Assembly symmetry: C2
Homo-oligomer: 189 residues x 2
Amino acid sequence: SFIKSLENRRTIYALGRNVQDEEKVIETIKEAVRFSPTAFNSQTGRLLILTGDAQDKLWDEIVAPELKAAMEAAKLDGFKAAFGTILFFEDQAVVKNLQEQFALYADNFPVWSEQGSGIISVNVWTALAELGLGANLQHYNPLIDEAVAKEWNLPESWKLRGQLVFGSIEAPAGEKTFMDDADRFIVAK
Amino acid sequence: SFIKSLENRRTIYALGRNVQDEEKVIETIKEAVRFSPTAFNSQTGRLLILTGDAQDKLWDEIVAPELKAAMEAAKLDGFKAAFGTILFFEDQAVVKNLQEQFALYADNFPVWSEQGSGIISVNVWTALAELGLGANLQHYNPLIDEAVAKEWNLPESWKLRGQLVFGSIEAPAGEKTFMDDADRFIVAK
Ligand SMILES: Cc1cc2nc3c(=O)[nH]c(=O)nc-3n(C[C@H](O)[C@H](O)[C@H](O)COP(=O)(O)O)c2cc1C
Ligand SMILES: Cc1cc2nc3c(=O)[nH]c(=O)nc-3n(C[C@H](O)[C@H](O)[C@H](O)COP(=O)(O)O)c2cc1C
Ligand SMILES: O=[N+]([O-])c1cc[n+]([O-])c2ccccc12
Ligand SMILES: O=[N+]([O-])c1cc[n+]([O-])c2ccccc12
Ligand SMILES: O=[N+]([O-])c1cc[n+]([O-])c2ccccc12
Ligand SMILES: O=[N+]([O-])c1cc[n+]([O-])c2ccccc12
């Protein structure tokens, strides 16, 4: 069931590369994004999907050095050890066009775009979990933005929002608590 | 399958009140939110779920008059005709607390909260579609915010982000197009 699918999606930090069918994984990532709703069907989400050598390169040659250079002013090995990383961007050129076409909603499009990024990120995350793969969501933007755009020749208009690290599950999700229903749901008739 | 569940979720404007098991619907809405991820497990989403007399009141006594008063400075009947409306808020008190606790990420929490709102909105939307119910997402915020908070005695900290109108499907979804894969997915190794 759908609710079961949602419950199955969890943050998994212990990831490996025991992935049987990479093509199936790629297909599923694309489908999850494809069937995600966006304001005005604007489809502002953009993905860079890295595996193999590119996965090694992201973490060893971009994230690590950028992070070090920043801090000055382990975990990374665990991210690198995963099968791949899905970098989620929002296309600002489309956002700006929407703002120009529908001036009435100009202030709203950045908001709906952020919402869109969350939407496709978790739909992909949940779809991967259905395949039995784990993932965790990271935010090394904006530190790595320029290096990533240069290495993989991305349009300047792609604004990095998140990085979903994914692979085989090598240890179970941790414990998680939930709010009291009474504090977040009100039902009225 | 999960991808099938995603594909089944569509914007349905023609909605009615042929809903067989309201309690099951409420349970499913709660579960979809419960099992949705949020930054720091902050669970900032808040829901006001209206049906029956409250559904009539929202659209006739709040949205209509506010909208008229604004414009001065049909569709509404179609929204009212639905079984209910799920109003999605983000709790700004929790957001502000996060900003204070983790000053390093202060600018990020509003962003992750917006992403969170998108996340729970579509998870609820998709869960309703699995039950065979249709829905559409509207944005009469911030116009109706104050009236809604007063009528249902909501905390000032609840910031309205969207209103998901839902009910029985009375006409099929319209046609929808998709981008070229090549323009939004890059795969590298
Ligand atoms: C963040 C967001 C905001 C949306 N806002 C509205 C809205 O205010 N009014 C409306 O009728 N539809 C709204 N939509 C629905 C989209 O237009 C719709 O999802 C998109 O055209 C894809 O069609 P589908 O929902 O049938 O898949 C919104 C969707 C998203 C994801
Ligand atoms: C918008 C958003 C941003 C998140 N950012 C991070 C992050 O930067 N690093 C991380 O390790 N987890 C991150 N998480 C994961 C959440 O902490 C996690 O989803 C939450 O604690 C619930 O746990 P679960 O994913 O196992 O259900 C993020 C989740 C969401 C929805
Ligand atoms: O009809 N509308 O005004 C409309 C349609 C579709 N989407 O996505 C919208 C999104 C935001 C505001 C109005 C929208
Ligand atoms: O191996 N990791 O990357 C890792 C393990 C455990 N926790 O809690 C983490 C938390 C945040 C980022 C990476 C983590
Ligand atoms: O370990 N972290 O830094 C971490 C854990 C969980 N969430 O949700 C985070 C979210 C944003 C930034 C860092 C996060
Ligand atoms: O009945 N409606 O509310 C309705 C019908 C058709 N479209 O396209 C709509 C579009 C936006 C809002 C309401 C709509």
